[PDB]
Amino acid sequence: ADFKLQVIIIGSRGVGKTSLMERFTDDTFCEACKSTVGVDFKIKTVELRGKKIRLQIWDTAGLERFNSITSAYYRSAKGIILVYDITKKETFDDLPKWMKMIDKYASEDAELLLVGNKLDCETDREITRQQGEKFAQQITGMRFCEASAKDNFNVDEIFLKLVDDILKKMP
Amino acid sequence: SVNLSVIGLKTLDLLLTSGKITLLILDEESDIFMLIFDAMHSFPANDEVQKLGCKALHVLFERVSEEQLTEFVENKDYMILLSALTNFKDEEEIVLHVLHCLHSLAIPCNNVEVLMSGNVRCYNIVVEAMKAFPMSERIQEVSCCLLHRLTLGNFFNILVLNEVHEFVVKAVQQYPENAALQISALSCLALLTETIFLNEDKLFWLEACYKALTWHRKNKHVQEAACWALNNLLMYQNSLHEKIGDEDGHFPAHREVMLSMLMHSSSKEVFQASANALSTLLEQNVNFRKILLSKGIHLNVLELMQKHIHSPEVAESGCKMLNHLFEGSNTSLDIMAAVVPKILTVMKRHETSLPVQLEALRAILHFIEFHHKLNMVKKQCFKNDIHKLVLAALNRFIGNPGIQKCGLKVISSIVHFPDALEMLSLEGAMDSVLHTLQMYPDDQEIQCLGLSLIGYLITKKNVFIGTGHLLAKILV
Lengths: 171, 476
Ligand SMILES: Nc1nc2c(ncn2[C@@H]2O[C@H](COP(=O)(O)OP(=O)(O)NP(=O)(O)O)[C@@H](O)[C@H]2O)c(=O)[nH]1
Ligand SMILES: [Mg+2]
Fold this sequence. Notes:
By secondary structure, chain A is an alpha/beta fold. Helices cover 26% and strands 18% of the residues of chain A. Chain A has helices spanning 17-25, 89-92, 95-103, 129-135, 155-169; strands spanning 4-5, 8-11, 43-48, 51-56, 58-59, 80-84, 113-116, 143-144. In chain A, strands 5-2-6-7-8 form a five-stranded parallel β-sheet. Chain A is globular and about 45 Å long. With 476 residues, chain B is mainly α. Chain B has 30 helices and no strands. Chains A and B meet through helix 1 of A and helix 8 of B. Magnesium ion (MG) binds at residues 17-19, 33, 35-36 of chain A. Chain B: Belongs to the protein kinase superfamily. TKL Ser/Thr protein kinase family. Chain B: It is found in: Cytoplasmic vesicle; Perikaryon; Golgi apparatus membrane; Cell projection, Axon. Chain B: This is Leucine-rich repeat serine/threonine-protein kinase 2. Chain A: Keywords: Acetylation, Autophagy, Cytoplasmic vesicle, Endosome, Golgi apparatus, GTP-binding, Hydrolase, Lipoprotein, Lysosome, Magnesium, Membrane, Metal-binding, Nucleotide-binding, Phosphoprotein, Prenylation, Protein transport, Transport.
């Protein structure tokens, strides 16, 4: 138990954040995953860089009714992930609005990371893998990695490369 | 030994109740907890292997550690919770002990967030409180004590899961005699009332809290919790201010809060809670702020501040209660004459906290032949040295603009006493007004209030040549 981390995970409704959450901690997938009804922990302690680092994942809801509830955690969130889908450009075309929820409340050390969900059928994706790289035009924090919770593809390097760069941002 | 381990557990279940063999059992090379866990892992699906074993952990978890307790959430809690709740969702003794041991290990803060996580979810407590006991006292008492223990800074999980902010209320209204149930439930409800009213229902807390105020009269803890929950209810749902009162159909809760303040006088905590309770009572009523005045409660709260003189919280609350009490009360001269040096003693005893002087300054304003009476009144008043207290207070707090208005109002009021240009010139006041004027130039209210004071504190000593340049610049 060296440090406890405060990553948040935000994104649209039914995109797969609650899917992508447990695939990293409980390693369990389920197509019939119930949408989260608020904020929710998921504890995890990973030893890295000579330090057993604790991790608090805060899966937010995404629905309009639960916009104000989740707002109290961004000002204490250390890292910040944004997850978005591929069939639904509408799940992409509100990322400045999500950024509007980011920029109004995020702190200085919020290292953004975008992630396309469900990369199994990217040929039918409404969004190109380069469009997010075309969306990567934001500040130096913003990164990108397409992935898939179903195929369990790169789900660690989502969190790991983030928390590595977070601990890299740590002195 | 599926038939000889059960009797060994039965011997243990009878042995552990004696106590002081327990520490000898811990002081061993057995790892007795690991023995019990290996046993329960070895023998699932067995009432006697499960129930007697949990009754054991029930008393055994009371004295282990803080860190092995903090260690145990690795996978140990997993065995108990999972097997018992899931395997035995109808075995009342088992869920009772399962809630009991979980409540016992719910002590360390590093365990609570594990208990409120996504994998380990402490809302099986709700499933128990609904299903396994709709009519059992022991299960409800233990579960509600657990839920009160769970309330760390993660309130927006417990409250948002509406099966907690409601089920606790039904638990309160069900059993109105269990005192431990009261001091857990009302504390939990006072900690959750803000977040649950960020989202009739307000009728629920009030009747239960009133009956709890009346019935468990002799106990202190239940009435600290009661006055706390009532205060924190009415200060967030103003619509049922009208639902109480000495009139018919109402609750005369103010009488009960006054009585509870009078009873447990020796405890500062209950007086703190009762003072905030009476404050928020008076804050939205005008009939109440004459009866307690006629009931002499001001002398009593003065006595209580004279008792707990070395404690700033109750001083803050006593001045705050005086504030809402005298909010629009005509007064004879004898009142303020007796009162004031007690309050200045309260301030010079706690001459460090902004709020204990915020509310006190907000209260003291109300008081400021009959002329001879006023003469001796103000003379003894400056003998109690109001002026040093307030001027050094503004000196102490360049911030806190509320006192930076009100204490100025007080001084401008006091300057109509013949000692002022003698004693405000035997102590000095004008430079503080100047430093605050440049501190608060933009505030129109502070500017206009302090400007007459500027005109009331300039003598030939202060307007001596060279010293008027700052005054000239600040006036223009
Ligand atoms: N094919 C595929 N489907 C996925 C993937 N991730 C999520 N889904 C689908 O998307 C659905 C949405 O689940 P969920 O995790 O609740 O999405 P969410 O936006 O996080 N909802 P909430 O935040 O409210 O819990 C899942 O039930 C699943 O069917 C993925 O990687 N591949
Ligand atoms: Mg989800």
